[PDB]
Scaffold this motif. Structure first.
Motif, PDB file in Angstrom:
ATOM      1  N   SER G 119       0.813  -1.171  -0.002  1.00 57.07           N
ATOM      2  CA  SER G 119       0.043   0.003  -0.006  1.00 57.07           C
ATOM      3  C   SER G 119       0.790   1.346  -0.069  1.00 57.07           C
ATOM      4  CB  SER G 119      -0.845   0.002   1.175  1.00 57.07           C
ATOM      5  OG  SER G 119      -1.804  -1.238   1.218  1.00 57.07           O
ATOM      6  N   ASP G 120       1.852   1.565   0.986  1.00 54.66           N
ATOM      7  CA  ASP G 120       2.302   2.670   0.940  1.00 54.66           C
ATOM      8  C   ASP G 120       3.309   3.062  -0.147  1.00 54.66           C
ATOM      9  OD1 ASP G 120       4.586   0.799   2.242  1.00 54.66           O
ATOM     10  OD2 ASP G 120       5.757   2.762   2.204  1.00 54.66           O
ATOM     11  N   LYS G 121       3.601   2.237  -0.963  1.00 56.87           N
ATOM     12  CA  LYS G 121       4.594   2.430  -2.122  1.00 56.87           C
ATOM     13  C   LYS G 121       3.878   2.306  -3.508  1.00 56.87           C
ATOM     14  CE  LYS G 121       8.553   2.630  -0.233  1.00 56.87           C
ATOM     15  NZ  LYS G 121       9.524   3.605  -0.665  1.00 56.87           N
ATOM     16  N   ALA G 122       2.583   2.019  -3.456  1.00 55.51           N
ATOM     17  CA  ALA G 122       1.828   1.987  -4.625  1.00 55.51           C
ATOM     18  C   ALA G 122       1.263   3.481  -5.088  1.00 55.51           C
ATOM     19  CB  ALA G 122       0.186   1.530  -4.063  1.00 55.51           C
ATOM     20  N   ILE G 123       0.682   3.661  -6.181  1.00 54.87           N
ATOM     21  CA  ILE G 123      -0.028   5.076  -6.508  1.00 54.87           C
ATOM     22  C   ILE G 123      -0.886   5.253  -5.686  1.00 54.87           C
ATOM     23  CG2 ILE G 123      -1.259   5.964  -8.504  1.00 54.87           C
ATOM     24  CD1 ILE G 123       1.006   4.443 -10.335  1.00 54.87           C
ATOM     25  N   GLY G 124      -1.937   4.224  -5.728  1.00 53.40           N
ATOM     26  CA  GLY G 124      -3.189   4.200  -5.021  1.00 53.40           C
ATOM     27  C   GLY G 124      -3.796   2.815  -4.683  1.00 53.40           C
ATOM     28  N   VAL G 125      -4.761   2.768  -3.935  1.00 52.38           N
ATOM     29  CA  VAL G 125      -5.220   1.359  -3.517  1.00 52.38           C
ATOM     30  C   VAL G 125      -7.023   1.417  -3.659  1.00 52.38           C
ATOM     31  CG1 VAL G 125      -5.779  -0.426  -1.859  1.00 52.38           C
ATOM     32  CG2 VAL G 125      -3.369   1.179  -1.854  1.00 52.38           C
ATOM     33  N   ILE G 126      -7.503   0.434  -4.014  1.00 51.67           N
ATOM     34  CA  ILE G 126      -8.811   0.384  -4.191  1.00 51.67           C
ATOM     35  C   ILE G 126      -9.266  -0.935  -3.423  1.00 51.67           C
ATOM     36  CG2 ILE G 126     -10.942   0.028  -5.711  1.00 51.67           C
ATOM     37  CD1 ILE G 126      -9.310   1.670  -7.867  1.00 51.67           C
TER      38      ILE G 126
ATOM     39  N   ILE J  99     -19.164   5.577   0.334  1.00 53.46           N
ATOM     40  CA  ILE J  99     -17.709   5.071  -0.046  1.00 53.46           C
ATOM     41  C   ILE J  99     -16.684   6.338   0.148  1.00 53.46           C
ATOM     42  CG2 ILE J  99     -16.394   5.029  -2.127  1.00 53.46           C
ATOM     43  CD1 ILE J  99     -18.566   3.609  -3.547  1.00 53.46           C
ATOM     44  N   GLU J 100     -15.490   6.000   0.974  1.00 51.34           N
ATOM     45  CA  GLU J 100     -14.461   6.900   1.338  1.00 51.34           C
ATOM     46  C   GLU J 100     -13.505   7.189   0.360  1.00 51.34           C
ATOM     47  OE1 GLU J 100     -12.645   5.566   4.936  1.00 51.34           O
ATOM     48  OE2 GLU J 100     -11.550   7.342   5.218  1.00 51.34           O
ATOM     49  N   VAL J 101     -13.314   8.407  -0.031  1.00 56.25           N
ATOM     50  CA  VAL J 101     -12.306   8.752  -0.865  1.00 56.25           C
ATOM     51  C   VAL J 101     -11.330   9.533  -0.626  1.00 56.25           C
ATOM     52  CG1 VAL J 101     -12.066   9.424  -3.325  1.00 56.25           C
ATOM     53  CG2 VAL J 101     -14.287   8.820  -2.652  1.00 56.25           C
ATOM     54  N   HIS J 102      -9.972   9.267  -0.919  1.00 54.89           N
ATOM     55  CA  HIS J 102      -8.763  10.098  -0.475  1.00 54.89           C
ATOM     56  C   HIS J 102      -7.870  10.553  -1.707  1.00 54.89           C
ATOM     57  CE1 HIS J 102      -9.579   9.887   3.805  1.00 54.89           C
ATOM     58  NE2 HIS J 102      -9.794   8.303   3.683  1.00 54.89           N
ATOM     59  N   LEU J 103      -7.611  11.848  -1.862  1.00 59.70           N
ATOM     60  CA  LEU J 103      -6.796  12.153  -3.039  1.00 59.70           C
ATOM     61  C   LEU J 103      -5.483  11.837  -3.095  1.00 59.70           C
ATOM     62  CD1 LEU J 103      -8.207  15.602  -3.347  1.00 59.70           C
ATOM     63  CD2 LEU J 103      -8.832  13.707  -4.710  1.00 59.70           C
ATOM     64  N   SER J 104      -4.820  11.927  -1.913  1.00 61.26           N
ATOM     65  CA  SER J 104      -3.364  11.237  -1.952  1.00 61.26           C
ATOM     66  C   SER J 104      -3.535   9.770  -1.383  1.00 61.26           C
ATOM     67  CB  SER J 104      -2.846  12.280  -0.948  1.00 61.26           C
ATOM     68  OG  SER J 104      -3.015  11.699   0.484  1.00 61.26           O
ATOM     69  N   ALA J 131      -8.662  13.035  -8.265  1.00 65.01           N
ATOM     70  CA  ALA J 131      -9.982  13.364  -8.093  1.00 65.01           C
ATOM     71  C   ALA J 131     -10.704  12.141  -9.058  1.00 65.01           C
ATOM     72  CB  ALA J 131     -10.246  14.716  -9.219  1.00 65.01           C
ATOM     73  N   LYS J 132     -10.196  11.379 -10.010  1.00 67.99           N
ATOM     74  CA  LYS J 132     -10.842  10.124 -10.223  1.00 67.99           C
ATOM     75  C   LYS J 132     -11.363   9.403  -9.370  1.00 67.99           C
ATOM     76  CE  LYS J 132      -7.309  10.093 -12.804  1.00 67.99           C
ATOM     77  NZ  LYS J 132      -6.109   9.904 -13.830  1.00 67.99           N
ATOM     78  N   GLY J 133     -10.949   9.219  -8.188  1.00 71.29           N
ATOM     79  CA  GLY J 133     -11.334   8.513  -6.977  1.00 71.29           C
ATOM     80  C   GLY J 133     -12.717   8.891  -6.788  1.00 71.29           C
ATOM     81  N   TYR J 134     -13.359   9.883  -6.691  1.00 70.73           N
ATOM     82  CA  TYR J 134     -14.683  10.525  -6.880  1.00 70.73           C
ATOM     83  C   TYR J 134     -15.351   9.992  -7.927  1.00 70.73           C
ATOM     84  CZ  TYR J 134     -13.574  14.120  -3.150  1.00 70.73           C
ATOM     85  OH  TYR J 134     -13.334  14.881  -2.176  1.00 70.73           O
ATOM     86  N   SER J 135     -15.031  10.192  -8.998  1.00 73.35           N
ATOM     87  CA  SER J 135     -15.762   9.695 -10.313  1.00 73.35           C
ATOM     88  C   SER J 135     -16.073   8.134 -10.293  1.00 73.35           C
ATOM     89  CB  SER J 135     -15.074   9.979 -11.440  1.00 73.35           C
ATOM     90  OG  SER J 135     -14.512  11.411 -11.419  1.00 73.35           O
ATOM     91  N   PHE J 136     -14.700   7.411  -9.926  1.00 81.66           N
ATOM     92  CA  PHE J 136     -15.003   5.870  -9.835  1.00 81.66           C
ATOM     93  C   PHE J 136     -16.065   5.588  -8.851  1.00 81.66           C
ATOM     94  CE2 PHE J 136     -10.046   5.747 -10.720  1.00 81.66           C
ATOM     95  CZ  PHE J 136     -10.486   5.829 -12.330  1.00 81.66           C
ATOM     96  N   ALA J 137     -15.904   6.317  -7.526  1.00 85.60           N
ATOM     97  CA  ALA J 137     -16.701   5.953  -6.520  1.00 85.60           C
ATOM     98  C   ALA J 137     -18.226   6.279  -7.162  1.00 85.60           C
ATOM     99  CB  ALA J 137     -16.451   6.929  -5.367  1.00 85.60           C
ATOM    100  N   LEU J 138     -18.527   7.424  -7.942  1.00 87.83           N
ATOM    101  CA  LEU J 138     -19.756   7.794  -8.293  1.00 87.83           C
ATOM    102  C   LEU J 138     -20.204   6.638  -9.465  1.00 87.83           C
ATOM    103  CD1 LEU J 138     -22.008   9.728  -8.534  1.00 87.83           C
ATOM    104  CD2 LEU J 138     -20.717  11.088 -10.119  1.00 87.83           C
ATOM    105  N   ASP J 139     -19.208   6.270 -10.115  1.00 84.57           N
ATOM    106  CA  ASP J 139     -19.543   5.333 -11.312  1.00 84.57           C
ATOM    107  C   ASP J 139     -20.151   4.028 -10.393  1.00 84.57           C
ATOM    108  OD1 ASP J 139     -18.963   4.866 -14.326  1.00 84.57           O
ATOM    109  OD2 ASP J 139     -18.464   3.161 -13.640  1.00 84.57           O
TER     110      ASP J 139
END
Lengths: 146, 146, 146, 146, 146, 146, 146, 146, 146, 146, 146
Positions: G119-126, J99-104, J131-139
């Motif tokens: 997780s900490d070295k990823a770009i992001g996590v879903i 759905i919890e979203v975080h930009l970083s 910001a895609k995090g928000y859109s995916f969440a909305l998707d």
């Protein structure tokens, strides 16, 4: 070849009897496998064994077993009980109840050995009764179904 | 006229089979003791059992077991395994080896049940296999005297 | 009838001198008690002693001690030092000062033995000096009173 | 000199009885040392004392103590109980046995004071008996040689 | 085929040099091998080596090494050092002494890299010195065979 | 002749009002009982009480309570709350709902008083309010039974 | 062979859909792979998939990903995320960017599941968005490239 | 000779300005002192200063300060804040209040630097404001003594 | 206003009886408030209530309570008991005694809910007794005043 | 509104893009909102948004959502994720899945940011994808509703 | 859960079948109990048992029996019949009808066995018939209850 009980041995268990050999037993893994097979067969139960030092082998085998209709695993994962989530999810994923066996008394040794990724999900655990723990586990296993 | 093996049941095990006997069986502690005696009788081994809800009575029995020359103790300490250092020291003080047994899988419950003041000094441990746990302990004990 | 000083020994200490006296020794609890009785007598002080393996017997004795007017307690709680909050609250309840004695050096053994529910409220503590700790404690207690 | 027994005081003990002389009393490190020296004089044993706020000076004194053939060290390390692995290893390395002593009840104070780098290797420990703590350790050492 | 000393590299160590050389030069795993091969030969000591990214493979290698009469192992487990008890149990199962090596200073990195399942069982451990660590390990290995 | 509500007082609560009646009042345990007896007699509820310094006596009483059909237990386990898993398993074993009462505010005391082996299975808890905590609990019990 | 983007599926993910399909749908690892292939090609991008139950197989695939110029990896490490430092050191050794996916909400489960070596070295996590999590990851991957 | 305010600087503060310095400033220990000494004279307060790399020296110095009738101490213990219980007991023993000062913000650095065996017993703490922190303490000390 | 007693309700409590009135029942906060007000009026005591989802609002209300001469505060902090040091310092700062109240048994839920920032400073605490908790707290409050 | 989906942004999210744009990027909250409102309209779903820096405002809005018949929340709680139980209890009180979203990537920063009082209760969590995090969440949210 | 019939065995009846099983059979007290348990299970009657060597334990049990609603008591008081007036007053005190059973013919023994403190208040008495005397009594009890 569809077993109705599979017994799985984790890493380093192939070395039973190979070293010394009177260190703590001239007993080998194969000895233990045979005894168990004959215990099974005298209850008209088919029983497989598996052992590997490779975690994925054990995982693949666990997957293979679910298609074979294996009703119950007896497992001595050895050091993998302190380490493999993969193994836990394998057993959980297929839903084969399992019984955990250890030869030596795990609570009498280092503190990292008191943590297990399987015990909370097993039907039960036997440790510190050497090879007999396997027979006991199978005994229970035989009555469980019949 | 002494017992080669003593079985000890801790607190609350007298309640076995008294509440909603579909809840977890009609099996009583008395039931278990008879199956254990009967089983000791076939091996020509004398066996006594003991139960109490008072830690001090169990400490006294263990001291008494030294006097009568008990050679192995099979103990279900139930909840005292998590709390009772006096019981540990009784077992070590009298220097009788023992096997620990629990009816339920302790690892599948509250975190506080994962700490034992006994397990590390036992020969070994069985938990989760219900009554049969005792019979396996006995089977083990017996071969060790034999 | 009555006593200035009460000595209280915890569970298992009744076992001193019992098992394998060659390695452990033949000094019994009685022996220790007579030595302290003589020590107290030489100094014109009254001394009673008590031992039980039952925690509630010990709490009761501590309550009685308040009624008797005991001025100070020397206690070897043994394994109850690590478990019995009930014993602590008994001592604080009766408000009788006490000194804690252990035969062996508790700090040299398992970590769970390093914790004590009494030590922070003792006048002081003596561990690892064998039976002489009671003498020393008594010597401290004699000075303290007369 | 030489001496058979050496009594070490760690840092800050030289402040005993100097300030606020009514409250924590008028007794001083000085007085204490006279009392112990005389207790050894009267049992025809030769006693040396030492006190420094310098850890190296204490460790050095310990190395000095080895060469002279010191039989037993009675050491109140004060603050350095909690912090000096150097002091632990000096004693282990010169292999002279010792008894740990503290004027106050260490357990009745801050939690950081509940850790000792020496306790688990000491013969034993005495805390909270004020000056007589020393006296008791000296008494023990005397009757251990003679 | 077969040897008297074994060097084992765990996962990812096969990428030395290959990760575009500016980050730590052009030095490869095979360069280090060929340097150790020579240091070995020059003292009439056979030396085999092994690298894999499969923990299983490496366990088998350690076992296989017992047959071959390997008298010591010099290992860089890499990641495995923080995760593999199975590896620990292999080296203890076979009872072949070992030295642990790490190219980078492991204690200057994430906190999880501060734990090892091997280092407590090692003869000793070298880290932070790069490839010269291997040669120092080999140097010591030789000097203690004869 | 059976009681619908049983009130249970743990160790040392017998000491209430005994020493230095300046301390938190002249209120005895018997007074508390009688205030409770009268309250239950007004709601036409039958109430029993029990107190002991011995854990096993209390566990026995809970078992008996099941047999006689007690509907609800109000328990001041006092010290036993931090230590007794057996008391937990006794209350769960008989499946009698309880309310846990303490006289003093436990949270305002030592950290080891913040742990309870009972609270998570109580209906509810009252600490800090002295004797009225027991009334409140009865008041609560009564309403729940009709 | 080569591929621009690589999806790596970890241990047990081969089991999607293959047991009581009304526990969690008929959606299989193959169906996910194919949808992603569809989506990837509808973007005119090359995508290769992989799945093993062997940690060393995944590490090998990742090393081979560097040689064949993979630009970004979308990985569901499954259970290896809590255990595998080698999987971490691999993805960092090849210095290929990656995104971590988990079908279920890993925070909603056992606490040992809350730590990751990735997780900490990823770009992001879903996590917790099931198969669409893979899709969203690819969406963002394609945009990061084209 | 005799003082009123004493400044103490711990180990390594002698290296200030010595290296480069573009680590931050050209500033030296001597500079700070002269700045502090000057500040005091403007208030008609006498001020001595002391620095050392030896814990004992500083301890000794704190003792002499009690002899001199020092009314307040401004201490920068440096790394000794995280390790010296001796220093703590020195300050509390002579019972001269004190202000703790650190040049750099301790809380922004390694986690072991968040610990102090002094801070809970200083009147206050200033960290991270450079040598000016010293002036601020001095001002503060002035108007508390005036 | 003025009120002798103040009942403060933390965030989300306004939801009482609002979502599916047969999940928890139809009781509302306003119902709770009328019952308490009337209870106070029967004892000739003025009592006022306050709820808010804003932490500042409650801190402000508590400050207002000092000006009003409020004697005792009954508070259900709801979520804020586990997070709000500010509300602790508010209550301590006006120095108004308070009783803590929770509708549900907080110890029977998540572990983060076991910890509280007010409980140790409150007179006492009541949890898991539903809305009757407040009435009991009011009943205690009233005999503390009248 | 009445709205079907509600997007909540916690504290500090209003600063998006304001400060030094070329090291974080130009995207502002209003951009995010515009994009979501567009995405939503395109599928005939009504979408309200909300930002505040006050915790109680967020909580109020969440209670306002329930009344409005909101079906799902997309929330970036920002800092409140590590600190706000109240927020947890709001969302569970209204029983609206979120759905919890975080930009970083939250796992890449200070350890304290690894814990969340919300994540275990969300359907799922997206972090580190901007910001895609928000859109995916909305998707996801739309295909769940529609 | 209450028993309608309680069977009570006095002192030394635990000795049955223990010594010299040639003496009046191998029949243990437990056997007798189980024969009785089975007989009562056939008449759909709930039966309990109790044995002790302590008079007060037996008197307690009779009191408890009243509380739990026992309808009839079958008692073999053994020696207590000649001596115990307290046992008499216990049975009269609770007003539970009983039948007195003896295994041996008391009248054929010493003259002091001809006296009973119970017989005149029993419903009836059976002596001389060994274990069947207990069955006969149950048989009699059963018929009288429906």
């Amino acid at each position: 070849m569809s077993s109705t009980i599979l017994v799985i041995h984790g890493p380093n268990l192939n070395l039973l009897g190979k070293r010394e050999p009177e260190v703590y037993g001239h007993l080998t893994l194969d000895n233990i496998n045979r005894q168990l097979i004959a215990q099974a067969e005298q209850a008209s139960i088919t029983l497989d064994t598996f052992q590997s030092n490779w975690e994925g082998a054990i995982v693949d085998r666990i997957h293979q077993a679910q298609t074979e209709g294996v009703k119950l695993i007896i497992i001595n994962p050895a050091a993998l009980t302190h380490t493999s989530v993969a193994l836990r999810d394998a057993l959980l994923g297929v839903a084969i109840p399992f019984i955990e066996v250890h030869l030596s008394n795990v609570h009498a040794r280092e503190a990292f050995r008191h943590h297990s990724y399987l015990s909370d999900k097993a039907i039960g655990v036997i440790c510190g009764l050497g090879a007999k723990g396997y027979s006991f586990a199978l005994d229970y296993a035989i009555e469980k179904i019949q």
